RNA sequence: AAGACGGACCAGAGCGAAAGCAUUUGCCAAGAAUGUUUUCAUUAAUCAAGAACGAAAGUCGGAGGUUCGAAGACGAUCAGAUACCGUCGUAGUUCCGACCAUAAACGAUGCCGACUGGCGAUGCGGCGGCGUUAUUCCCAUGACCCGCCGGGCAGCUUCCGGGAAACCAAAGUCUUUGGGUUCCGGGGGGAGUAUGGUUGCAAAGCUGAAACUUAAAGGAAUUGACGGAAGGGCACCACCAGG
């Protein structure tokens, strides 16, 4: 797995999961995400399993790892809370950030304003990124999607359960998934955690 | 009304009350009143008068089931409807015997052997008397103490006890011996909290011009048939071995032996039946009755004035703060232990009626004062710079909670009357204790509780006089080298055969170096010395020096 | 009377102190009726109870008195109880009555002492006790709010004068002495600091002299070393008012000094043999400590405490029979 | 006074085989759901015949006719209106006891049984809750919340699958064709006419053709165009104010 110890959640991670609120989920019944739910709050708010978060945080990184290019890894964030995060994901991982609208046709559409050639897609919310997920399904593209307890799961390959909506739960996973790949391939090597905080991350919060 | 004919519809009109109860939803007001409609419509007699017999058997069953139905704890007027018709059914039964029980005298309308079992319905009539008794048990429990109406409901106990006579007299002792677990206990149930006050009106009313007719020679014997039937069914609780009730009876016999008889028997029967162990397996609400019993042992230790037994019957009780919950009245946040409310609901739906509550302020004045006259001359030996028997966890420690009170003015609390009399006991003046105890327990009505309390006071008069004479001798011991017997007979108001029993036991049992000439009535002591009491105080120290030095080698080897 | 009082908390914290003070008058008219509602049936049940015969009820009196059923009359006892929702709410209001409490410094602090002394002498001495602990806390925590409240405007000095009376009356009448005298001693000590805050007022100190003079009776009843403190504090704080107020009581002051001489030394030997084993030095410390409260820190002896009154020229001023005695 | 009818409350709700059922209250037996270590031991399934029920108008005979109201007629309407319209009104409506047996009795959609997906309600019963509220001195109630169980009403939602599409967890598990049982169609007519049967008091109901006629009829869906369909904008070849 790599260095198995910090790959079994450290309290630095564990607090940040609580700090970004990733453990929380929605209120909706699942049939593909209820495995990733730890428990539910009084009259229903789902505590997700951070074990399921981390173990999918490892393997979806390991899907990106041993691709010799982050250039054919197009990471996707239509949410503005992750647009700083995929900016700081592409700053750290080197992947291809996708902010905002997909502009339908980058994967189809010979005659088009653009064309991209990825291999794996990473998604903040497959409902907010369904237009990537359509053209992921069109031209044989696997897709990692951050899924909460209300997310869609059709055409969704390996899914990391997170709260991943609104809060810093978005920018923590991009802090963590860029952690996990530099943990595997980088100068934060040999499965060491980061020394870079998620304050280079979490989204802008227009300032004073 | 329902149907205007005889017997045949009426049993079906009887069974329709018997059938309609067994539902998840059932009102039972109509079930009661139609039975009275079937009383009057059975104007035929033994074609219908026997129908009333099962109607009165089923009125009470309809009256009883009517009030775990809305509230709660049956209303006592609904219970007095039970009290009316149980009386009325026995009024029928005294005129009845074994008719509509049938037993092939006739069959229609007869035969409680027709469905079913002619004694069992008669036996369940006795179980309807239980239903009169069970709600009255709640009525004695769930009615307020300060409420003067609680006394009004408590007046109906003799009316129940009348039926306890009237059943067993109409019995036909199938019901007696089969229910000798209970029908005998029904005789206990009106005995084991009863009083010597009526026994003073029974036995100590002089039978010279009062108990000359056979009227006071039948009702007073019924007052002591209850103290008879308990001994009559000691030997039947040899048969009816029934350790949930047998151990419970013998403790109530010990009640009768302590209160209703002489407490020498109650001391024996506790030693006799050995009820240290049976109480555990047999329903520890009987342990509450056991703890009620050894309290009442200490009561008749105090009624017989025995101070050690007032301390030693309050050994399973007053070595613990359990005695609050030994009447079942402790609070949940009284400590960090009493949890929870639902178990508190179980214990307090169970326990206890207010006439079954007792005076714990008396019990503390039983427990504290009894060792106050003991331990103070005892500690006056200790506080004479000679101590080896300092007993930890004692009335000494029950004194400590009242001792260190420099602000304490007038004695007003029950412990304050003890602690003031304790200081009066420490002065050696006997008279000063009597101001602090006897008047203040009349002020707090604690003396006002017994008819024997004048003797109990007079017993504790001499226990103050003889023992403060000892603290007179214990405290002023070094300079008393000649001690009178003529003066001390006049001083502490104690006659010579007491004083000879005092002063010899002051010389023999205390082992004071003292010459005595009882012909001359003179005690000659010469203790020698008070500066060598420090030599005794150092031999208090250095003897401990040799022991743990030896114990240093005892553990290590 | 409490849910509406929760409005009366927040609705009448709206600066109509005409309305606030009149409701304090109504806060007595709360209790003025339901004091009498018991007090009618105090007679009227006992009209019926004497009309009832105890001779026929003698086995029920055995069911009463051997049980100690103690036939109280709940006609009173429940009409006794319902003005406690009227009483205790106003005490519970009092700590929250900040920034002026002058409808209550004038009235309610003393109206509590008015209402308490009725119901304490009627039935409720234990409902007195914790309430006086409650009042002392709702004295203290109300001060510990410090939302525009001081003592030096003589706000807390009549709050003292009410609460001191609330202590000293029940103590003398019938109370446990260990507890309410601490409610007096914690009142007297703090308000000695509040007198120190409010530029020592000698007339509540003359009341404190009377609080000593009360205690001189009580410490000839309870503790001679406290009486060694208090009778020495009785006389000189009066002798200050002989100078401060210029008392022209030349028969009384010549006879209060002989009152101050004779009782003051008499401290015999202790009789407590167990208390010597039970660490007398803790007790004499409290005998010292509440004498430090009164300002006569070490409890003075037999003879040298006389000599305080002898060296001071008031022994000359004794009505001369005692002087000869 | 008369006779009529219980609005609103009143719903993707209930019950009832449908046709159906809206004042209260009572009686009467019924039926569903639910729960059920109860019982029967497979008694089950579906259905020609056969039978029940089956709106309405009609009719049979009354009551009834307040109200309305086929007919009916005007007043008005229009080239014509008998119609809509206004007026008056018969039968009818009202209701009883009959026939009638029909309806778009339509959900245009056999039964029963099986299997295949997501959610949130609601009527129901039973259950789970340190759930709330609520009464009596509080429990046990109930109102209600979360959850569950069903059998419901159904809804929403998805390459569940299909379908000509429309749409449909059924209108899926069909060419990879078969759960069982009943019913019905073979392009369009002529025509439910003829013909006979047949009932019904009749009105009419039911069973049920041929000659001849025809290469189209039909269905969805796309696209136009149209509208006395609806919603948008603009021009003095359109208005306004005007000359």
Curated annotation (Swiss-Prot), chain A:
Q: Enumerate the residue ranges of region (Interaction with PPP1R16B).
A: 53-112
GO terms for molecular function, please?
DNA binding; laminin binding; laminin receptor activity; ribosome binding; RNA binding; structural constituent of ribosome; virus receptor activity
Q: Which GO terms describe its biological process?
A: antiviral innate immune response; cytoplasmic translation; ribosomal small subunit assembly; translation
Residue numbers of N6-acetyllysine PTMs: 51, 88
Q: Which UniProt keywords apply?
A: Acetylation, Cell membrane, Cytoplasm, Disease variant, Host cell receptor for virus entry, Host-virus interaction, Isopeptide bond, Membrane, Nucleus, Phosphoprotein, Receptor, Repeat, Ribonucleoprotein, Ribosomal protein, Ubl conjugation
Which residue ranges does the record annotate as region Laminin-binding? 160-179
Q: Tell me which residues bear Phosphoserine.
A: 42
Q: Where in the cell is it found?
A: Cell membrane; Cytoplasm; Nucleus
List every position bearing Phosphothreonine. Answer: 96
Kindly provide the PTM information from the record.
Acylated. Acylation may be a prerequisite for conversion of the monomeric 37 kDa laminin receptor precursor (37LRP) to the mature dimeric 67 kDa laminin receptor (67LR), and may provide a mechanism for membrane association. Cleaved by stromelysin-3 (ST3) at the cell surface. Cleavage by stromelysin-3 may be a mechanism to alter cell-extracellular matrix interactions.
Q: How does it assemble?
A: Monomer (37LRP) and homodimer (67LR). Component of the small ribosomal subunit. Mature ribosomes consist of a small (40S) and a large (60S) subunit. The 40S subunit contains about 33 different proteins and 1 molecule of RNA (18S). The 60S subunit contains about 49 different proteins and 3 molecules of RNA (28S, 5.8S and 5S). Interacts with RPS21. Interacts with several laminins including at least LAMB1. Interacts with MDK. The mature dimeric form interacts with PPP1R16B (via its fourth ankyrin repeat). Interacts with PPP1CA only in the presence of PPP1R16B. (Microbial infection) 67LR interacts with capsid protein of Adeno-associated virus 2,3,8 and 9.
Its biological function? Answer: Required for the assembly and/or stability of the 40S ribosomal subunit. Required for the processing of the 20S rRNA-precursor to mature 18S rRNA in a late step of the maturation of 40S ribosomal subunits. Also functions as a cell surface receptor for laminin. Plays a role in cell adhesion to the basement membrane and in the consequent activation of signaling transduction pathways. May play a role in cell fate determination and tissue morphogenesis. Acts as a PPP1R16B-dependent substrate of PPP1CA. (Microbial infection) Acts as a receptor for the Adeno-associated viruses 2,3,8 and 9.
Q: Which disease is it linked to?
A: Asplenia, isolated congenital: A rare primary immunodeficiency and life-threatening condition, often presenting with pneumococcal sepsis. Most affected individuals die of severe bacterial infections in early childhood. Isolated asplenia is distinct from asplenia associated with other complex visceral defects, notably heterotaxy syndromes such as Ivemark syndrome.
| Name assigned to this protein | Small ribosomal subunit protein uS2
Which residues of the entire protein appear here: the answer is: 2 to 209 of 295
């Amino acid at each position: 797995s790599g260095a198995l110890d910090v790959l079994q959640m450290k309290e630095e991670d564990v607090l940040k999961f609580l700090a970004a609120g990733t453990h929380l989920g929605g209120t909706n019944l699942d049939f593909q995400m209820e495995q990733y739910i730890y428990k539910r709050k009084s009259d229903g708010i789902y505590i997700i399993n951070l074990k399921r978060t981390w173990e999918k945080l490892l393997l979806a990184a390991r899907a990106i790892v041993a691709i010799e290019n982050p250039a054919d890894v197009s990471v996707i964030s239509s949410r503005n809370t992750g647009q700083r995060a995929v900016l700081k994901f592409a700053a750290a991982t080197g992947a291809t950030p996708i902010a905002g609208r997909f502009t339908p046709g980058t994967f189809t559409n010979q005659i088009q304003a653009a064309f991209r050639e990825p291999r794996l897609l990473v998604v903040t919310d497959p409902r907010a990124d369904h237009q990537p997920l359509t053209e992921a399904s069109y031209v044989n593209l696997p897709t990692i999607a951050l899924c909460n307890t209300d997310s869609p799961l059709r055409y969704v390959d390996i899914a990391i359960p997170c709260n991943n909506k609104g809060a810093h739960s978005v920018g923590l996973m991009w802090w963590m998934l860029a952690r996990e790949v530099l943990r595997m391939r980088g100068t934060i090597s040999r499965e060491h955690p980061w020394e870079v905080m998620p304050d280079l991350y979490f989204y802008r919060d227009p300032e004073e | 009304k329902g149907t205007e004919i005889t017997h045949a519809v009426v049993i079906k009109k009887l069974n329709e009350i018997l059938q309609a109860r067994g539902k998840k939803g059932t009102d039972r007001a109509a079930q009661i009143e139609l039975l009275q409609l079937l009383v009057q419509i059975a104007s035929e007699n033994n074609l219908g008068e026997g129908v009333i017999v099962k109607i009165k058997f089923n009125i009470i069953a309809s009256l009883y089931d009517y009030n775990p139905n809305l509230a709660t704890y049956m209303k006592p007027e609904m219970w007095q409807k039970c009290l009316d018709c149980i009386n009325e059914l026995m009024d029928i039964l005294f005129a009845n015997p074994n008719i509509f029980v049938g037993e092939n005298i006739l069959e229609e309308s007869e035969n409680l052997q027709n469905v079913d079992q002619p004694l069992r319905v008669r036996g369940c009539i006795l179980t309807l008397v239980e239903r009169m008794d069970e709600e009255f048990t709640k009525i004695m429990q769930n009615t307020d103490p300060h409420s003067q109406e609680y006394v009004e409901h408590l007046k109906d106990e003799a009316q129940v006890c009348a039926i306890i006579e009237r059943v067993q007299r109409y019995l036909e002792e199938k019901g007696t011996t089969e229910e000798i677990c209970r029908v005998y206990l029904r005789r206990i149930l009106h005995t084991y909290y009863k009083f010597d006050y009526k026994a003073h009106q029974r036995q100590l009313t002089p039978p010279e011009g009062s108990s000359k007719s056979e009227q006071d020679q039948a009702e007073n014997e019924g007052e002591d048939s209850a103290v008879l039937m308990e001994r009559l069914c000691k030997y039947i609780y040899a048969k009816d071995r029934t350790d949930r009730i047998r151990t419970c009876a013998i403790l109530c016999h010990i009640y009768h032996h302590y209160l209703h008889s002489r407490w020498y028997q109650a001391r024996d029967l506790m030693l006799m039946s050995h009820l240290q162990d049976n109480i555990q397996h047999a329903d520890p609400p009987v342990q509450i009755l056991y703890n009620r019993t050894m309290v009442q042992l200490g009561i008749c230790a105090f009624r017989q004035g025995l101070t050690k037994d007032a301390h030693n019957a309050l050994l399973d009780i007053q070595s613990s703060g359990r005695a609050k919950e030994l009447l079942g009245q402790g609070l949940l946040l009284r400590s960090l232990q009493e949890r929870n409310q639902e178990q508190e609901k179980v214990e307090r739906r169970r326990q206890v009626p207010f006439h079954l509550h007792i005076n714990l302020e008396l019990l503390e004045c039983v427990y504290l004062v009894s060792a106050m006259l003991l331990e103070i001359p005892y500690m006056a030996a200790h506080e004479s710079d000679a101590r080896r028997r300092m007993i930890s966890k004692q009335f000494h420690h029950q004194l400590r909670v009242g001792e260190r009170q420099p602000l304490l003015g007038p004695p007003e609390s029950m412990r304050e009357h003890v602690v003031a009399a304790s200081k009066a006991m420490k002065m050696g003046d006997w008279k000063t204790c009597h101001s602090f105890i006897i008047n203040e327990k009349m002020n707090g009505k604690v003396w006002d509780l017994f008819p024997e309390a004048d003797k109990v006071r007079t017993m504790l008069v001499r226990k103050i006089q003889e023992e403060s004479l000892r603290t007179y001798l214990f405290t002023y011991s070094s300079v008393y080298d000649s001690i009178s017997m003529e003066t001390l007979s006049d001083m502490f108001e104690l006659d010579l055969p007491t004083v000879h029993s005092i002063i010899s036991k002051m010389i023999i049992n205390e082992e004071l170096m003292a010459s005595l000439d009882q012909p001359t009535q003179t005690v000659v002591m010469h203790r020698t010395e008070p500066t060598a009491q420090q030599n005794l105080a150092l031999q208090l120290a250095e003897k401990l020096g040799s022991l743990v030095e030896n114990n240093e080698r005892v553990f290590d080897h | 009377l409490a849910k509406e009082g929760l409005y009366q908390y927040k609705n009448i914290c709206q600066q109509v102190n005409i309305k606030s003070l009149e409701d304090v008058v109504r806060a007595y008219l709360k209790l003025a009726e339901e004091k009498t509602e018991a007090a009618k049936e105090e007679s009227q049940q006992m009209v019926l109870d004497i009309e009832d015969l105890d001779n026929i009820q003698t086995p029920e009196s055995v069911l009463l008195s051997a049980v100690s059923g103690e036939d109280t009359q709940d006609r009173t006892d429940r009409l006794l109880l319902t003005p406690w929702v009227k009483f205790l709410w106003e005490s519970y209001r009092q700590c929250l009555d900040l920034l002026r409490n002058n409808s209550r410094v004038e009235r309610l602090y003393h109206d509590i002492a008015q209402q308490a002394f009725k119901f304490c002498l009627q039935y409720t001495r234990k409902a007195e006790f914790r309430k006086l602990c409650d009042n002392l806390r709702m004295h203290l925590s109300q001060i510990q709010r410090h939302h525009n409240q001081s003592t030096a405007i003589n706000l807390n000095n009549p709050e003292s004068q009410s609460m001191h009376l609330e202590t000293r009356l029940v103590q003398l009448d019938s109370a446990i002495s260990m507890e309410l005298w601490q409610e007096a001693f914690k009142a007297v000590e703090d308000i000695h600091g509040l007198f120190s805050l409010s530029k020592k007022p000698p007339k509540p100190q003359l009341m404190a002299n009377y609080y000593n003079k009360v205690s001189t009776v009580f410490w000839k009843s309870g503790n001679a070393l406290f009486h060694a403190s208090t009778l020495h504090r009785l006389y000189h704080l009066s002798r200050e008012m002989r100078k401060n107020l210029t008392q022209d009581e030349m028969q009384r002051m010549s006879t209060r000094v002989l009152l101050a001489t004779l009782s003051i030394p008499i401290t015999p030997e202790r009789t407590d043999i167990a208390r010597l084993l039970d660490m007398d030095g803790i007790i004499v410390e409290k005998q010292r400590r509440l004498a430090t409260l009164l300002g006569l820190q070490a409890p003075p002896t037999r003879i040298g405490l006389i000599n305080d009154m002898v060296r001071f020229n008031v022994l000359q001023y004794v009505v001369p029979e005692v002087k000869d005695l």
